[PDB]
Design an enzyme around this catalytic site. Structure first.
Site, mmCIF file in Angstrom:
data_model
loop_
_atom_site.group_PDB
_atom_site.id
_atom_site.type_symbol
_atom_site.label_atom_id
_atom_site.label_comp_id
_atom_site.label_asym_id
_atom_site.label_seq_id
_atom_site.Cartn_x
_atom_site.Cartn_y
_atom_site.Cartn_z
ATOM 1 N N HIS A 61 49.692 58.780 7.940
ATOM 2 C CA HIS A 61 49.488 57.487 8.815
ATOM 3 C C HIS A 61 48.513 57.458 9.866
ATOM 4 O O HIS A 61 48.113 56.523 10.182
ATOM 5 C CB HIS A 61 50.949 57.245 9.365
ATOM 6 C CG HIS A 61 52.146 57.317 8.571
ATOM 7 N ND1 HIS A 61 52.610 56.676 7.408
ATOM 8 C CD2 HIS A 61 53.202 58.338 8.516
ATOM 9 C CE1 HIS A 61 53.671 57.105 6.972
ATOM 10 N NE2 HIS A 61 53.882 57.944 7.610
ATOM 11 N N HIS A 91 48.313 61.437 19.178
ATOM 12 C CA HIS A 91 47.494 60.869 17.918
ATOM 13 C C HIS A 91 46.914 59.690 18.377
ATOM 14 O O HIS A 91 47.028 59.376 19.490
ATOM 15 C CB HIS A 91 48.725 60.514 16.819
ATOM 16 C CG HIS A 91 49.699 59.604 17.408
ATOM 17 N ND1 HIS A 91 50.880 60.174 18.203
ATOM 18 C CD2 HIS A 91 49.731 58.247 17.503
ATOM 19 C CE1 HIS A 91 51.463 59.019 18.439
ATOM 20 N NE2 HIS A 91 50.952 57.965 18.041
ATOM 21 N N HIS A 93 45.688 55.501 17.395
ATOM 22 C CA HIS A 93 45.796 54.172 16.467
ATOM 23 C C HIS A 93 44.367 53.548 16.578
ATOM 24 O O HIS A 93 43.675 53.450 17.525
ATOM 25 C CB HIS A 93 46.781 53.264 16.696
ATOM 26 C CG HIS A 93 48.039 53.853 16.907
ATOM 27 N ND1 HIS A 93 48.959 53.645 15.753
ATOM 28 C CD2 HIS A 93 48.754 54.514 17.833
ATOM 29 C CE1 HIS A 93 50.003 54.222 16.203
ATOM 30 N NE2 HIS A 93 50.099 54.854 17.247
ATOM 31 N N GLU A 103 47.233 49.204 19.955
ATOM 32 C CA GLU A 103 48.481 48.574 19.678
ATOM 33 C C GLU A 103 48.787 47.947 20.959
ATOM 34 O O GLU A 103 49.217 46.632 20.890
ATOM 35 C CB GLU A 103 49.332 49.618 19.404
ATOM 36 C CG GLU A 103 49.035 50.487 18.504
ATOM 37 C CD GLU A 103 50.233 51.302 17.932
ATOM 38 O OE1 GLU A 103 50.983 51.960 18.495
ATOM 39 O OE2 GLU A 103 50.484 50.827 16.617
ATOM 40 N N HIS A 116 47.871 58.009 21.919
ATOM 41 C CA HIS A 116 49.224 58.227 22.440
ATOM 42 C C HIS A 116 49.643 59.742 22.584
ATOM 43 O O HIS A 116 49.725 60.658 21.734
ATOM 44 C CB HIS A 116 50.046 57.575 21.368
ATOM 45 C CG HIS A 116 49.894 56.083 21.403
ATOM 46 N ND1 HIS A 116 50.811 55.244 20.568
ATOM 47 C CD2 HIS A 116 49.422 55.025 22.093
ATOM 48 C CE1 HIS A 116 50.727 53.978 20.810
ATOM 49 N NE2 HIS A 116 49.965 54.125 21.815
ATOM 50 N N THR A 195 56.071 52.930 17.906
ATOM 51 C CA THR A 195 55.710 51.753 17.141
ATOM 52 C C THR A 195 55.388 52.142 15.511
ATOM 53 O O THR A 195 54.538 51.142 15.035
ATOM 54 C CB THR A 195 54.104 51.651 17.799
ATOM 55 O OG1 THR A 195 53.376 52.620 17.618
ATOM 56 C CG2 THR A 195 54.457 51.217 19.151
HETATM 57 N N1 LIG Z 1 53.046 55.456 17.859
HETATM 58 S S1 LIG Z 1 54.296 56.372 18.068
HETATM 59 O O1 LIG Z 1 55.590 55.722 18.480
HETATM 60 O O2 LIG Z 1 53.928 56.765 19.639
HETATM 61 C C1 LIG Z 1 54.268 57.825 16.939
HETATM 62 C C2 LIG Z 1 55.307 58.439 16.901
HETATM 63 C C3 LIG Z 1 54.980 59.630 15.728
HETATM 64 N N2 LIG Z 1 56.077 60.624 15.587
HETATM 65 C C4 LIG Z 1 57.439 60.274 15.166
HETATM 66 O O3 LIG Z 1 57.634 59.094 15.342
HETATM 67 N N3 LIG Z 1 58.195 61.418 14.862
HETATM 68 C C5 LIG Z 1 59.721 61.410 14.619
HETATM 69 C C6 LIG Z 1 60.384 60.382 15.321
HETATM 70 C C7 LIG Z 1 61.675 60.526 14.952
HETATM 71 C C8 LIG Z 1 62.341 61.459 14.162
HETATM 72 C C9 LIG Z 1 63.978 61.374 13.651
HETATM 73 F F1 LIG Z 1 64.546 61.248 14.643
HETATM 74 F F2 LIG Z 1 64.113 60.508 12.855
HETATM 75 F F3 LIG Z 1 64.143 62.527 13.132
HETATM 76 C C10 LIG Z 1 61.578 62.424 13.521
HETATM 77 C C11 LIG Z 1 60.119 62.276 13.795
HETATM 78 C C12 LIG Z 1 53.986 59.505 14.929
HETATM 79 O O4 LIG Z 1 53.914 60.658 14.027
HETATM 80 C C13 LIG Z 1 53.121 58.612 15.087
HETATM 81 N N4 LIG Z 1 51.810 58.656 14.203
HETATM 82 O O5 LIG Z 1 51.435 57.622 14.165
HETATM 83 O O6 LIG Z 1 51.253 59.806 13.555
HETATM 84 C C14 LIG Z 1 53.244 57.681 16.148
HETATM 85 ZN ZN LIG Z 2 51.250 56.051 18.556
#
Ligand SMILES: NS(=O)(=O)c1cc(NC(=O)Nc2ccc(C(F)(F)F)cc2)c(O)c([N+](=O)[O-])c1
Ligand SMILES: [Zn+2]
EC number: 4.2.1.1
Length: 257
Positions: A61, A91, A93, A103, A116, A195
């Site tokens: 992603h 990371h 976007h 975003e 971010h 997001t």
């Molecule tokens: N745009 S952002 O919100 O800041 C954003 C966040 C992440 N990472 C996660 O979301 N990890 C995660 C969240 C919950 C769990 C759980 F709790 F489900 F285990 C496990 C892992 C991400 O990879 C990116 N990205 O685009 O690479 C953007």
């Molecule tokens: Zn992000």
């Protein structure tokens, strides 16, 4: 599963993650005339002198740079936060053209990309616990506009060739995230969400007013990455941003007048 395409993009996410339609979803448009200056907001405290980056990963992603968060090495405090938040990853976007990519938007203006920096609240013990809490994460958001090259970003740009496709990773030690910050730390803040799925509403968003500049060539290298895995049909990794969501019962606060 979910992505940013025509058949699995953000307009579809609510079918697997109904919180996509919740009360504090991100990103949002920042209306600079209706945001409220709050004099009780403290300056941000960014302490990244001891940060330990570990590796860089194409997760299908975006691309993540991961840090050692087993100790209080790189932390964020102050601002609207109570407690200490540890940096875990950063990371971006970005868009397929320079006119889109971020975003968050400012007075409906889109920037070419958004950085971010993700931090989690240490009182919860690990990242997995923190995302289940309304004050679990603090994400520092930085806009990128196309112009002069950003020297501190070039090391990230140069290694992207080695993580072209989904699931590839490379060793990425000794990277200094202080090279990515703008001059001023003036910010807007509001309560929001991740997001990307699972879209948990666990984030204090801290969005810096001052963008950083990067060169056309630098963002070009971003858009040579690949959503697909090796040996699959090539799909360029571009436009991996979610559009602005309704603000609903929330107020954007500003640290500056
Ligand atoms: N745009 S952002 O919100 O800041 C954003 C966040 C992440 N990472 C996660 O979301 N990890 C995660 C969240 C919950 C769990 C759980 F709790 F489900 F285990 C496990 C892992 C991400 O990879 C990116 N990205 O685009 O690479 C953007
Ligand atoms: Zn992000």
């Amino acid at each position: 599963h979910w992505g940013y395409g025509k058949h699995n993009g953000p307009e579809h996410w609510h079918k697997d993650f109904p919180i996509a339609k919740g009360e504090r979803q991100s990103p949002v448009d920042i209306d600079t005339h209706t945001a409220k200056y709050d004099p009780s907001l403290k300056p941000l405290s960014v302490s990244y002198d001891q940060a330990t980056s570990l590796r860089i990963l194409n997760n299908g992603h975006a691309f993540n740079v991961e840090f050692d968060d087993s100790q209080d090495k790189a932390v964020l405090k102050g601002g609207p936060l109570d407690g200490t938040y540890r940096l875990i990853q950063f990371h971006f976007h970005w868009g397929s053209l320079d006119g889109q990519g971020s975003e968050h938007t400012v007075d409906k203006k889109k920037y070419a990309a958004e950085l971010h920096l993700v931090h989690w609240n240490t009182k919860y013990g690990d990242f997995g616990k923190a995302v289940q809490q309304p004050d679990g994460l603090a994400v520092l958001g930085i806009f990128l506009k196309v112009g002069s090259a950003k020297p501190g970003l070039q090391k990230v740009v140069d290694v992207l060739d080695s993580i072209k496709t989904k699931g590839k990773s490379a060793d990425f030690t000794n990277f200094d995230p202080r090279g990515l910050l703008p001059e001023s730390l003036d910010y807007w803040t509001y309560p929001g969400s991740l997001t990307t799925p699972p879209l948990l509403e666990c984030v204090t968003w801290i969005v810096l007013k001052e963008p950083i500049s990067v060169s056309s060539e630098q963002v070009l290298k971003f858009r040579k990455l690949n959503f697909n895995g090796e040996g699959e049909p090539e799909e360029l990794m571009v436009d991996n941003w979610r559009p602005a969501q309704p603000l609903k019962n929330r107020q954007i606060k500003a640290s500056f007048k």
